[PDB]
């Protein structure tokens, strides 16, 4: 077996491992859009001749906490062919990739995990939380606070393209697992808007100055709206699109995935009628360079200054100076004050994850227990973190 | 219609009432046993004669933030007779208890909802939440990280009563939520540990000298265990208990009433084998006091002393001063700078619920964005606020 | 906002309120040909520039008992979007095209409801009951008594259509409940015969001189065969029909939906392996004009002439003289005999609902019993109620 | 109703049939080319003008123990209208096709029972098994001993055809129940490898010198893999296949239609998890010829010549004499040793069902037990019998 | 930890680990009863003080081919506790009981495993097969050629318990799997036979002669009858009793746990109506001595006299002549012929698994294929192997 970047030649035998691994392969024309965002040298394949093994990363751009954008890897299409497994061939391509990614310059890689077990071994951690609510329209009232109580309109998605765009670019810069979402991601979208015959059933949009909905009728339980995504920038523009999805008289029930601070429950007389009925680790993070991450993103303002000595398992020790919500990050042979690999850290990044649980788990190891009360308020994000898309 | 405090006449219609509105209503045994935990006068019924309303508090004692020990009344044996709906007595029964629990000297009271929108338009807010993971323990391994790579014993509940309640003792005055159980409760559930014909399947224990499990297997799925309880003083006490739980290796399932912020998920190499199958409002608190309950718990150290006027909707409005964790809560007619309806603050009471996301669904009001951000500071708790037992 | 005549540039926004509102939107095409049966002014749209709500009626021809056709406007198309819910669109446009339906003479107004807590306070009565049979064809044998013990052949739909408009046209002026079914709803009902993929499977048709059945293999359960329409003119047709349904071999079972008086289950040896399995409220009645639709339908002959006096509730007060099978329904100040709401007549008008069960529940009050029985008596179809097809 | 063989313009009558009879009608495309399989006078339709019965059968060629080819009539597109039953058309066209079948000199007939109750009666008795088994691979582990501790390539099944042909000639010719596979049936079978919109989704294989498997995902259960067919000549290629079948890593089960001698649940640790989730006659046979049929095969060598005197109800009685694995089948009036109808001679014919487990069911009558081991032992087969394709 | 034959003071906390380990756990009233068969130095514990780990073994007597009756050490009572999974118990308490069984001179141990995984590694190998076949009884019909077209009664288990032993001894001695039932198993079988408050409604039993059925209604599905055991020394009393069972006009459904070549199916006009609805491995056998195990049984006396060199993996090479029914057994340092490991000769050794089949996953090693067919004769059971009862 050989590791290279695949020549066009290597593309059919993609393509191939593509659809026998991934059963959302659209096909080869969604898969050469997906393609314009993978950077040249941004893909490995393993050969015995025949394709057997893929992996790349696309060019991302990822809002972490404080508004700042970070240049972002995200690995996708990594496929193992059946017949090839348990030869070390994830962990070359991974490698390879790695080393790629680390020496293009980028601070963080990130990817969407179709197993739990996989990546956290690669310095991979759950740094975002999928939380689907499912909603009883049928008794769901809004509380007297609620705001607006027509600023919504019922409206063909591919007709207020520049709309959503402008929307969604608001939104991705705002809240942190924000991502830019290029031209031939909005191509995709418009075009899975679409009924097709023997799948999904006709997309619509609810449009706000400040916010919109997607959402179709599920294919086979007809009383059933699934919201495919909602994005709004302000409480107004998220109160007044719940209001209209209420409103589809039609369905018993409309679901979302959102994220654990979604503030629909708190909308309603009956907070229980916005049931959680799944959860999931969404973005993972793998810090490619501790130093960069660290002082790129922005601390809560509420913690006072303070320093210790952070070492990441086999990714160096650092002098960690907090305060006036940044942070300074430098090398050091001190003696650690808090220990953790790799992935955990990509954990607290985004602050999805409290460090004060992932040391009841020993992840996150400390005897000072004043610091790690520092650290969970440090790392903490004011704009709760979302996932943006799946990739 | 009369309402008053019952007399020992009144109690077999009570049972009776009681016996048509709960279905896990055990028998006039069991509810003789909580009946010690009732003061006198801490009943009130409705007769048309016949019992067709009733509602009472039991004497409790509610850990909150800062292992402070409240005082606390717990609503509960509330049912209005189904020949009796919409006449209003449910709010007569609980307006007079409040004010018997006001007089008294409660800080607060506390209840168990059954629907989640009876309780708001009386000042309760949800301020726990319970969360249920369900482990497929047949692919669960532990991560390297993990405590304890034999500690736990497997033992009969009713031959360690005095360590189970010493370990518990130790639980609820550490953890926010916590509560008092008294020899009375304590009977109560060594006797649910029985198997009964047609009914549970005798429970077991996992004891280790900082924690406890009991748990059943479910009446029907018999590859299923149901954890009842589970009390862990240390991070090594929990895990090992898990460590046991996971080797019960004729289940396929292991499922748990919880907290958001258990650790479990962080023990396991792969987090989404612990599955959240479910997601509730807990306790729920109605401040009775606001000054006496906002200067009795604790408050995080790590947000730097603040003042701000604080309006409760026909509760008043206080000038609330914290800083170096304690708060100070005066008599003010100065401007509100921040308002919420009562049933807001006992949400944030213990720390479950973010000011922050309160305010994005206009619950909590204020034009500071950080001011909010001290509160959300403030209010949350070091220690993860958990659920201690229904009532 | 305005209610208005939609002019040819109001469609596209109907048509896409119409897909948002009804998941059986087929699409514009279909739209168009059943906008062929709408009136000039059959038509109105609530705009907010965009249709915020829409509703119309087609003209339709409706047989009541006595073999009496009617012209009646029936409702359809009806929709208010999800963004102006709460705001009387529905009410507003209800009260305007009945406005005009009076002015332009119709005596009866019909529509099929989509929820059953909606219509009655704008004067609909559910006036036939819809009865879905499913039998176990595998035991099904025919009584020594059922006639037919080969009339009937297995047929392309689309190559019979000629002799299917000829045995619906004799059946819909045979039956209270029968329409007169369009050439438009003919091109849609074969084309709706057709396999589509991803959809329905391919329909068959069973024709006799006097009846047919149209039935197709369910999408999903291969072994459950639905009939969407069996018209029969004879009982010899029905139970020929029938034999050929239960000689479909490769079932396990065969569903219709059909009327509460089917004789099916009393061809079998065993009743009741014909299951009711669903039971629904078909057609609704407004009754426009109370005179005109009493004096035109024929009562049962075996009452003898009686006198009353009928109040409905804001409909006028009538003296009603029924005998030899017809009515006379003059205005009249004397005291009611009878009171009802408009909803109520609705009901009793195709003999679906006895006057007896109505005045049970108080829905009409008389304190004579001997004029509940004549009316009861009176109002009674001999031959059953159907419902014809869905609009 | 008359019988006879059809005319070129019986056939659109026939496909009409087809279609009301057979759900698995792809439609007239395919049917004509299965046409191609059909002698002259292969087919027979009764009339009442239109088709309401169709019999025919088709020429194949079926492997049987020795590894002997016996031309064999398939029967299939076997249908009586659903107006039609109970007058004895399926009796009247089977005796038919079965005069010209004997007459033709094949000395088998063979077909796949729609139902288990009909083809008894005909003398067809079931002589192949279906086995499914289902692998929860997620627990997969191979056994130490199992072979191949890359020789399988994924790939797209219409660029392998020649490959698949030549593997599964070396299949069929060795393995009793083996059927020639004509090139038409080579085009319907990579025909149905394709995705259909609404329908299967894309089919892969697995290619190895000596053996194929061809696979789908489920249309609705995303994670199972369903095994349309693996043809493997060598048990190094079977358990390859198998190898690559487990390493489908993002199903949780593989399902495939097997025999009940598959060797899977060997080469696994934990021979429980190849569960078998159903099973169901394969192949019928009826016997044309009892000594054309008895002489072809080959018996098991393990057994010492002997002679009997068998008899088949109303189809002969014969001195059966059985020695270094040959038959020797002659006529005698001498007195029967062994008698059975002409059904449980076909169930016995290629080794599926013992002759002693015939004997218990009193479906074969001898008074000799030692002559029952006997028949038990000769009529086994060395290569267990399989099931080639439906028909 | 310890390993030891348990103390009296030992009992207590093995009954505890047994209610934790097994939900069929009686109780210690049963588990007393079963105790009566453990002799001597029969049980083994693990101590931490506390048992964490058990193992014992009864003295069975179990049928073999040519009706052989040997001494069998049959292990039950296995667990390990929870708290002490991955140290090796179970691996060192086998390794005690097999010393203390081959040194008691036990040719055979024999156990029910409780997962499919744990006993292949010790030597244990499945050797009969667990069959459930579900009839639906609404549309049995009996062939004509099926026996007995009153011989049963209806009785109450308890008054026959002399009738059901006899038939039951009749049958052990005569099948292969039979096994000998002692008087404390009869008195738990009746005692089991009785209805329980929430538990099974009572038993009825169908008594023939020649033998019997145990039946009762299933506690939830009140259409589904279980036969708990039918035991039948004749083909007229297997096919009486069935006659009876299908008589059960109230059920749609009996259900029965049987073996392979029940001839029930083939009693009936359509086969497919005994639908096998699980399959399972029954008994596992461990040959502890190759010699005495392999002399002792009867082999096929249609193979003739043939010699060969079988070698068991770490358990012997031996030279084996199987002729004229019998074989003999000697060392040798001859080159082997045949290999395997000794779970496999424990699956070959009753006939349930044929010698080709095991051969074809590798599990059994020859370059001879004429020797192979002649293991797979000789090995043949002409009784087919049944499952006694569960241990
Ligand atoms: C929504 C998700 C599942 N879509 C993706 N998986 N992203 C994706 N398919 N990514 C991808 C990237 C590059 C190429 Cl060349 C081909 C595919
Ligand atoms: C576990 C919960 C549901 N148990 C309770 N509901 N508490 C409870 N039953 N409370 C209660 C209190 C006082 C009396 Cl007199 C009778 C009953
Ligand atoms: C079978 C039923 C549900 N079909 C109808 N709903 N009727 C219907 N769609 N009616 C309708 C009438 C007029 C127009 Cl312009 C557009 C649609
Ligand atoms: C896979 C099976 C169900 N396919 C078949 N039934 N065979 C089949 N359809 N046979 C067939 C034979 C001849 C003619 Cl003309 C038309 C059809
Ligand atoms: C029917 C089966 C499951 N019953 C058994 N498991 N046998 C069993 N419980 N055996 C057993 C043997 C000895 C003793 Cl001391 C205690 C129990």
Same mark, same amino acid.
């Given at each position: ?9 290597? =593309? @059919? ?25 993978? @950077? ?38 990594? /496929? ?65 606070? /609620? ?9 063909? @998605? ?12 608001? =939104? ?13 991601? =909005? ?54 699109? =719940? ?91 001190? /003696? ?56």
């Amino acid at each position: 077996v050989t590791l290279c970047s695949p020549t066009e030649d290597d =593309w @059919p035998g993609m393509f191939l491992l593509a659809a026998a691994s991934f059963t959302d392969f659209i096909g080869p024309e969604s898969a050469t859009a997906w393609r314009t965002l993978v @950077p040249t040298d941004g893909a490995v394949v393993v050969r015995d001749s025949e394709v057997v093994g893929m992996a790349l990363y696309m060019d991302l751009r990822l809002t972490v906490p404080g508004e700042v954008v970070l240049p972002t890897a995200g690995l996708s299409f990594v /496929a193992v062919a059946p017949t090839h497994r348990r030869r070390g061939l994830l962990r070359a391509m991974c490698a390879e990739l790695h080393r790629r990614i680390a020496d293009s310059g980028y601070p963080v890689a990130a990817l969407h995990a179709s197993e739990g077990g996989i990546y956290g071994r690669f310095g991979y951690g759950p740094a975002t939380t999928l939380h689907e609510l499912t909603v009883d329209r049928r008794f769901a009232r809004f509380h007297a606070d /609620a705001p607006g109580g027509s600023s919504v309109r019922l409206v063909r @998605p591919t007709e207020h393209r520049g709309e959503f765009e402008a929307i969604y670019e608001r =939104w991705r810069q705002q809240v942190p697992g924000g991502l830019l979402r290029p031209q031939v991601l =909005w191509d995709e979208l418009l075009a899975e808007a679409k009924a097709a015959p023997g799948g999904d059933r006709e997309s619509f949009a609810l449009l706000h100055p400040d916010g919109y909905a997607l959402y179709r009728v599920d294919r086979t339980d007809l009383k059933l709206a699934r919201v495919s995504e909602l994005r709004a920038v302000t409480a107004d523009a998220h109160c007044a699109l =719940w209001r209209a999805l209420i409103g589809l008289d039609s369905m018993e029930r409309i679901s979302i995935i959102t994220h654990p601070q979604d503030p629909l429950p708190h909308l309603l007389t009956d907070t229980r009628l916005a049931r959680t009925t799944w959860r999931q680790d969404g973005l993972w993070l793998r810090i490619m360079n501790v130093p960069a991450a660290l002082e790129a993103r922005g601390y809560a303002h509420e913690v006072g200054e303070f320093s210790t000595v952070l070492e990441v398992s086999d990714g160096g020790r650092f002098a960690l100076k907090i305060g006036d919500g940044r942070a300074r990050c430098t090398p050091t042979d001190a /003696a650690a004050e808090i220990e953790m690999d790799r992935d955990v850290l990509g954990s607290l990044y985004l602050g999805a994850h409290r460090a004060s649980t992932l040391a009841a788990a020993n992840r996150l190891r400390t005897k000072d227990s004043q610091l790690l009360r520092r650290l969970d308020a440090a790392f903490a994000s004011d704009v709760p973190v979302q996932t943006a898309f799946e990739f």
